[PDB]
Amino acid sequence: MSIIAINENGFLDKIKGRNPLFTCVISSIETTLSIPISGVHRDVIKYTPSADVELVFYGKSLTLKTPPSPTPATITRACVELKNIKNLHIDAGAFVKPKIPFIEIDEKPTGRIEEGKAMNNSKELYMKGYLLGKNLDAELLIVGESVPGGTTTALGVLLGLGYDAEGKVSSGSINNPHELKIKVVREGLKKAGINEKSSVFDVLNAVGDKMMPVVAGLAISFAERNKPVILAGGTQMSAVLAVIKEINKKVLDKNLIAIGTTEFVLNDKKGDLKGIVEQIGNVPVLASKFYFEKAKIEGLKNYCKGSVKEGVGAGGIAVYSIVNDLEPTKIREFIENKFYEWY
Amino acid sequence: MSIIAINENGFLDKIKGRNPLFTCVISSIETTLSIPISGVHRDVIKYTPSADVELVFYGKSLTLKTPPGSPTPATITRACVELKNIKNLHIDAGAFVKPKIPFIEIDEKPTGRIEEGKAMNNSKELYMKGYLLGKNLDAELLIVGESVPGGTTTALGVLLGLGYDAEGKVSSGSINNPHELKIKVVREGLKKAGINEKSSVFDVLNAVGDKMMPVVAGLAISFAERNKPVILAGGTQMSAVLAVIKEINKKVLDKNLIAIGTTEFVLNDKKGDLKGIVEQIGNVPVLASKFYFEKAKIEGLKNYCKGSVKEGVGAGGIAVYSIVNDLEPTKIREFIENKFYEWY
Ligand SMILES: Cc1cc2ncn([C@H]3O[C@H](COP(=O)(O)O)[C@@H](O)[C@H]3O)c2cc1C
Ligand SMILES: O=C(O)c1ccc[n+]([C@@H]2O[C@H](COP(=O)([O-])O)[C@@H](O)[C@H]2O)c1
Ligand SMILES: O=C(O)c1cccnc1
């Protein structure tokens, strides 16, 4: 098969033939404007998350001339079309808003991580995600993210919750500035005073990003109804998985929540995803194989060398798509064919 | 029993059992900040739509200290979501003040000045967005309402611009129904915009429509294309929407999946003629919910029997679904009296 399943625990059977809703949660981080923590090029980073979800929902970016080595939203759009997957998208603080219809949970971007001032309202954000979740329906929730800099806020949250994660976080590019990232989050974990006294929300408030409580609410509201949730992302979704255990360890016991990502994230050298998960729980981690070795866009080959890797729920929706008899090469063909248009 | 049906045509069974999505589309009109076309108090008109959908989704209003002079019909909508656990997501298409609850933002800019013929310039694009959003919503039945202060005026202008006999037929928010101020406004606007019979539905919407109209059109046509039923939960405003649905896609109408769902207070409004608008449009089920509000225990609710508020926020349409699916009508009225002091 083209699906690496670690701690599968029956899950892939849970999502076979089930009707999905896909949703991507986007956010922007103040720090990224002046500190190069993110692998998203600075000329497009204010526009990248919205252009991502526009490409998924509508088939064309509008906030940019082209989409953002192409954006992983290319893979997410591939699966949306190739398997006709309904998708709605959520804003929790992107600098520039989507010109497609979208759900507005929070207009204000994630603040400056290095100051312990990520956000003053992570619990409110959590409740909005759960309430929003209560009013969505499907047999399965595939929930992704588009947060430039999200691997840095993922580091702080994991660390702030007492996990061992240095060097373990991934990145949206080949280079992975782990030292800058550690320096950034440590400064704000300290300015905000996070210790082992602190709640999950104290930590999110210091160094998290606003996508995280929202996706936490969504996931728990869906798992509580014994509906499976595919946390579609890499490193970042292990921070959310962690946050979900600090919020309701009970539902996590239910076995209804799996991380779904790409081969390029599972098999990433400059990080260690399964190591972080291990410290959290016996949770299914599922990577999807895309065979971009045999590609015809050298932008797509570049995924095999650490360019991009993941994002916009690409890996987890591919997992879903592939479990439901999608030929994994179609993804590569789709992007291949649509490429000249988009760019 | 508790449901009056014009040309029911079997629609009632098509909706029994099926599980619904309720969505309210809100908007605001610049014209209501200067001209008294609307029955909403001027002091809270800028803040009403947002507060209405707050009440319905979250159980209480946040932009105002209390829900929106009589009591807003969101209480009716609110009541029904809790009693039949109707899932609900709400849509903004130009309200002055955005809601504090999670909402789908389609257009932040309000509806323009009706009298100048400058309601909007993106009606076709708003319809394409409502349609594409429809595609990505899943339910067995869509119940789509609205909350647009001044919306009976834009409904009149749209109906008149499309060649209908609609004067004196639109209903109103409060007991008073300034029909001729309404007519001067939209006729002024139609003239400035140059609408005549060669104009398109979108030219008309851009002259004197409101932005919720084409969004609801898109939502309704997408669900009905997929053979799902659709309740347009509104009064005369939804007859304007119904007219719009017919210009855009006549044949979907002919699939008998789209009905209007309103209150008894609208269908029995002598200061209006909902029935008469719709028979010029086509043979479409018109369904109204009986509330038995004279047995009411708060005069504000009771005030409905005399023409205050009447309808709004999918209240009539959401009740039709909640009654067709075996909810006892009085539970609505006894719900709103139990919490009247919490809200107020
Ligand atoms: C062009 C491009 C578009 C993307 N959209 C999402 N991601 C992905 O990379 C980001 C996280 O990595 P970091 O911590 O380096 O910001 C997220 O936005 C994730 O969705 C992208 C990555 C790239 C290169
Ligand atoms: O469409 C109708 O027939 C109708 C009848 C009574 C009340 N309404 C509600 O009141 C507003 C429209 O009425 P008006 O008088 O402000 O044009 C808007 O908020 C609607 O939800 C609408
Ligand atoms: O592991 C992640 O979360 C990740 C890696 C690369 C790009 N975006 C996200």
Author numbering:
A (entry chain B): 1 to 68, 74 to 348
B (entry chain A): 1 to 68, 73 to 348
Sentences from the paper on this structure:
Cobamides (Cbas) are coenzymes used by cells across all domains of life, but de novo synthesis is only found in some bacteria and archaea. Base activation is catalyzed by a phosphoribosyltransferase (PRTase). To gain insights into the mechanism of base activation by the PRTase from Methanocaldococcus jannaschii (MjCobT), we solved crystal structures of the enzyme in complex with substrate and products. The protein fold consists of an eight-stranded mostly parallel β-sheet with connecting α-helices on both sides where the substrate binding pocket is built from the connecting loops and resides at the end of the C-terminal end of β-strands.
These crystals were soaked in 1 mM NaMN and a nucleotide base overnight prior to freezing. During that time the enzyme catalyzed a transferase reaction. The contents of the two active sites are different. One subunit contains NaMN, whereas the second includes α-RP and nicotinic acid. NaMN lies at the base of the active site for chain A where there are extensive hydrogen bonding interactions with the phosphoryl moiety, and specific interactions with the ribose 2′ and 3′-oxygens and the carboxylate group of NaMN. The coordination of the ribose, phosphate, and nicotinic acid moieties in the active site that complexed α-RP is very similar to what was observed for NaMN. However, there are additional hydrogen bonds between O2’ of the ribose and Oγ1 and Oγ2 of Glu 150. There is a hydrogen bond between an imidazole nitrogen of DMB and Oγ of Asp 52 that fulfills the hydrogen bonding potential of the benzimidazole ring.
